[PDB]
């Protein structure tokens, strides 16, 4: 029901991240959130690979994935 949104943002990432490394770092970040289940670790690493206007779209992009609860805590941790 909301799979297109993932591939849509993910697709945007590839467009804004031609390199493979940036993608490698992002992969580790996503795997961390799934394993650790902590949005605090995601915010930190996220900025590292999303500290640029061009990379910013990833911060807001991945968010939608995060559950409502983690969304509130995630949004709080983020500059907004």
């Amino acid at each position: 029901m909301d799979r297109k949104v993932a591939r849509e943002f993910r697709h945007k990432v590839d467009f804004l991240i031609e390199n493979d490394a940036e993608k490698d770092y992002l992969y580790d970040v996503l795997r961390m959130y799934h394993q650790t289940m902590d949005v605090a670790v995601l915010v930190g690493d996220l900025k590292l690979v999303i500290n640029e206007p061009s990379r910013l779209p990833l911060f807001d992009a991945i968010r939608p994935l995060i559950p409502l609860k983690h969304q509130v805590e995630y949004d709080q941790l983020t500059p907004r």
Binding site: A6, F9, R10, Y27, L30, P64, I66
Partner: peptide, 16 residues
């Protein structure tokens, strides 16, 4: 439905 997991699988598949 685990959206995060969906994106991870999407990438792994987009790799090949």
């Amino acid at each position: 439905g685990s959206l995060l997991k969906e994106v991870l699988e999407d990438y792994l598949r987009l790799k090949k």
